[PDB]
Subunit: 284 residues, 4 copies
């Protein structure tokens, strides 16, 4: 009768080597053949306990067989393991505003999945518990883009990859913020400034009137004020002070008509301009 | 604005410790809280890379959050990993014949499952490509016993475990052989032993007639001959020789009537007894 | 000609297994024999690169040989490695006061050294850079006790162990504090209290006089006041307040003579009693 | 009282990270400062056990200190470890003959030393039990070349490195064979070939006389015969047969005078030429 199948009782992967221990018929030949045509053979020690280390072969595939001194073969023991942990990332083309920060205004961002072994057949993406199938593109790259817009907020996202044997590895999570929201800001003459004949006609006797900038979101990275006088527009950086965001022209204006607006941009590259405000300076 | 969520870029488990590296807002507090209510806090270095090691918590469960110098808190990063590789084995109580060779005559053997974490939600046993769900006994031990007898043959078996979070680990396989089959053997007088008048009457004039033992399966581990004389049965060990299995009485037989059968036992502990053979010694 | 010696080009120890890779004559038999009589043999693959894992044998000792298909042996390659990191600790018998804290008043504390493999032949102890030979006692335990008293202070201590092959491992450090110092404390009548006919005769008209406890070191764990009146002594726990350490008897004393002292104990179990103070209460 | 010194109870290096566990005053700040000026701070958990991972710093150098909520600082715990295992190898420039077999005719071979950390203060080469100190060339590469020729034989060699702190690592050994020896070979006319009148005159009547090649060391890898005729030398490859090494001219020789010698080269690249043999063909 041929020897009984060898038994693998321990395995570990340490630095691209598979380390194994098991049992097999004392004195027989243990034959390990990998997916790459490599063969490693050893003599099972007298107590029938063996140990071995082999380089990790393509797709984690190898088979172990016992052969006795007279050429009889055991049942083979096919093994198919997996070692690579998959990675998921926000595509740079779906990463708006500042690049690299995992914040974007793309409500249907594309995710790219990497570090997959060549026998991976199933790739799924978990978005806050909802699981979706990933797609493989023309270049053989796995990716996922939501079919409907994601609402604004912060999403915990990971990828799960399995091979044909059903080995499954789960990525580290990433945290992606969808931010497609920015309040339209507003510019107005500050409290004392709309004076003279009225508190609401936007006609002021101040040649250097002070403006309040309101509805400026906390995640704003840039605040500018646009001033158009006689068909010519100049842009100024807003002041952020103890009083909030304000604008005062850096020199006195001639009497005349000024159209102002304020523009805000946030981290995701959202951009809004205020309704315009038509002011008249009248100091004489 | 609160700080952005911290990022874990690397993890590994080395002797009961989870080792992590990541990024986070420079100078912020990174707070790690595990399922056991432990809290590990660290200050993120100026270059924004952090590293840490924590004891593996119950169920692989912990969350990481960033808090700034003003007490504003980031979105949390929940982790739920699994480290234990499950083990499956043939129950000693289902391992017939030679012990510990994964060969049994039990057609519904019990497999014992071990090394599972408390948050496991799927325990599956793959038998030659078909998965069945494992069961838990009243003591809390996971096992699988097939509901219907297995056919004789070779069975590659593994167990797969998954937690609630979806992490999955696959055992090393075992190879179990079901062997409930054993050919009924045959005892006869060997060539030249059924002598005297007729070659077919089973009357011999030899006082130590040689018998041939036939139809002995290759996995037989024990061969005995049962000799009944004067109503009483004696058991003898057969001898395997250059001509195969035979039996010659160890001392001379008296004239009279004998009844013989051979019994074989295979490595799985199956046993078969031949038809009986009535011989007369007439010397 | 016999095969050339096999070459080991990689080794690592992972969980009681020695993992090895190297080169040797293609198709030859590689024979690994350990210190415990164990033999592990394998066939060198066709490219002449081999890998193996063996249980760590006694004293990290094994030899590797090549044998060709016709029985000729190479030069052997003897290996002798070491895996255990030595440990040093303060002996519990040299650990005064609170046990377990590495603080002691023993200026010649004994250190115990452990986790040494059986082939270790040299054991040295490094105390803030000064290196000393350890000794082995009757039970075969390595230890070190300083020959002269160590001055008070904090010492960074480690152990270095080597085997016969000259492999050397260095322990983690320990930090041991020698504290054999405690100021003798003093008890005195507080500012207003030595009154009546004099500010320095220790005769007071206060029936519940207040005492100051001075020269109490910061590392004191216990402060008590001893009061002897008519040959009978009672002990009280001192008060630590906004004013420091003080004592006031919890009820009025009869007129008469009181002898007081204060006793301090520190973490190392150092213990000092003040000079006694003879006070007289006279309220009539 | 400042807090007591923190304690490191466990360390290990796993892919460029130092992994540590220890104890320290509960709720205190543990500050780790490395040789590169990085600082990693953590809050010690309520149960007083801390764990951490840091990138391996230049020279394995870092210190750990405890600071309490009031800014009092413990005694520091300086660590200085070493992770790199040194490597030694035979310089290709000193590896004669067959390349990469650690066998050479160079009696003062150069060994190249690699994988040393910047704080190394001892670099030693052990040759069959005697240590010599290694040298550093002007480019900064450590090496050892013996000052006096090595005798022929087998040399087990390893390198040992130590830092200023006293940490020591030992390389895997190499086995180098010095072989500068090769027996001078011999060419003669084989049995029956020195024929005709005298068996000793080296006049043959064979136009393709067979020659025996003798005193060929077992480690010979190349055997050639130099045939000089009419003042010009031709080189032939000898043939190793069932009778050993021989040479028969590949085509018939004209009557006249020939001069022969055999040249052997061994695996180490040593070469020897035999004495010349003058033969006359007279057919
Ligand atoms: Ca695979
Ligand atoms: Ca972005
Ligand atoms: Ca926004
Ligand atoms: Ca107005
Ligand atoms: Ca889990
Ligand atoms: Ca069995
Ligand atoms: Ca099937
Ligand atoms: Ca059977
Ligand atoms: Ca008959
Ligand atoms: Ca050793
Ligand atoms: Ca103590
Ligand atoms: Ca003290
Ligand atoms: Ca007085
Ligand atoms: Ca160092
Ligand atoms: Ca060479
Ligand atoms: Ca020597
Ligand atoms: Ca030679
Ligand atoms: Ca002649």
């Amino acid at each position: 009768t041929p020897p009984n199948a060898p038994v693998v009782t321990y395995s570990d992967i340490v630095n691209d080597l598979i380390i194994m221990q098991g049992t097999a018929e004392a004195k027989s030949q243990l034959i390990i053949t990998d997916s790459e045509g490599n063969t490693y053979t050893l003599t099972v020690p007298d107590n029938g306990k063996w140990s071995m280390a082999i380089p990790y072969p393509s797709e984690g595939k190898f088979t172990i067989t016992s052969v006795d001194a007279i050429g009889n073969r055991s049942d083979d023991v096919p093994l198919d393991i997996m070692k690579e942990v998959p990675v998921i990332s926000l595509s740079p083309d779906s990463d708006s505003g500042t690049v690299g920060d995992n914040i974007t205004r793309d409500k249907q961002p594309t995710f790219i999945i990497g570090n997959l072994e060549s026998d991976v057949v199933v790739v799924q993406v978990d978005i806050n518990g909802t699981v979706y199938n990933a797609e493989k593109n023309a270049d053989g790259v796995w990716f996922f883009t939501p079919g409907t817009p994601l609402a604004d907020g912060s999403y915990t996202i990971s990828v799960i990859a399995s091979d044909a044997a059903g080995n499954q590895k789960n990525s580290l999570p990433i945290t992606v913020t969808i931010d497609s929201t920015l309040t339209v800001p507003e510019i107005a003459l500050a409290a004392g400034e709309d004076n003279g004949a009225s508190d609401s006609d936007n006609v002021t006797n101040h040649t250097q009137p002070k403006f309040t900038l309101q509805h400026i979101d906390a995640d704003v990275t840039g605040v500018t004020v646009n001033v158009t006088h006689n068909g010519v527009t100049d842009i100024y950086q807003a002041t952020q002070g103890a009083d909030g965001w304000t604008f005062t022209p850096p020199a006195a204006w001639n009497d005349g008509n000024y159209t102002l607006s304020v523009t805000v941009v946030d981290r995701a590259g959202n951009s809004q301009q205020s309704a315009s405000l038509a002011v008249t300076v009248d100091s004489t």
